[PDB]
DNA sequence: GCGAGCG
DNA sequence: CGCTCGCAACGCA
DNA sequence: TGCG
């Protein structure tokens, strides 16, 4: 049929192909229209607050998740008037205009473009040199899974954050692991925030060394949860809160309370189930913006590691370097 | 999914 | 016109 | 010249 128009909180968004299948395993429950309806359910409320003012990359499947994948950082030169952008700087020093999430219409436009997963930077525009978010990525290695991740998050990481006077917010990744966010004052750069995250990861590890590893080299990790400290680098992003994932059942990265995480199963949260699960339930991340935390406690961990003779760790193998940057 | 470049 | 082609920043095997 |  011809295209239709969605009125998204006052902004008109062109919408096509509602019945195109994106998730074959789900049949009629895996159409592009189902995906747009899910995003309409979350983009005005809890998802928008967590994405607000952030530049994002888009992981697009215009022909569904078994077709071509388009990972897109730059915004197309020609695009609707209602989309806003902001300037990000990549590890090489190149800059680009990235889509900035300012209104539910930009999430719905992304969905119309086939975006399954949104990937926000850890900064807010326009101060895109200073993260306001430290990310902890609990990544089960072969032989481990979500049970290990939720156990380590609840029993090791959360009590450590309590001891440090820090508050963190957990979500399922929608894969096998767990993400934990700390809102921080935007007072430190990517290098400093990443060092803080390395010191946090090393402290989690030394509290549960049989369950946790920070080893960059895979042959040393074993059947343990890896804390991927490099996710705090520049141009390293995360699937956003409330993003659908490229899994056969369209799982969703789901914010939880710490109490819920203890017994959670990530397959419970999909683009088909999440809206009904939010109804009547307090947003567990309602307070994330209420306290702009200092990195101070984690930078103390950094200095203590330096006294142990432990400094920086390798960046990812593909990681660029800026002409003036320090040892990668 | 869509615009730019081609023939 | 219809049709194909980018859409990732990057170091490496 | 691809891999991911
Ligand atoms: O080259 C890349 C490739 C992925 N990136 C981002 O990082 C995450 C990678 O997530 P990952 O930990 O590898 O796996 P998950 O999707 O989080 O599921 P999991 O819990 O099973 O690990 C996805 C993107 O937002 C990135 O920033 N740069
Ligand atoms: Mg917007
Ligand atoms: Mn992960
Ligand atoms: Mn990871």
Author numbering: 4 to 331
Question: What do the study authors state?
Answer:
Recently, it was reported that a closely related enzyme called Prim–PolC, operonically associated with ligase C (LigC), is specifically involved in LigC-dependent repair of short DNA-gapped intermediates produced during excision-repair processing of lesions in mycobacteria, further expanding the repertoire of pathways in which these diverse replicases operate. A notable feature of Prim–PolC is its favourable activity on short DNA gaps of 1–3 nucleotides, which it preferentially fills in with ribonucleotides. Although the crystal structure of the apo Prim–PolC showed that it is remarkably similar to Prim–PolD, it contains a unique C-terminal extension called Loop 3, proposed to be potentially involved in gap recognition. To understand the molecular basis for its gap-binding and synthesis activities, we elucidated the crystal structures of pre- and post-catalytic intermediates of Prim–PolC bound to DNA substrates containing a two-nucleotide gap.
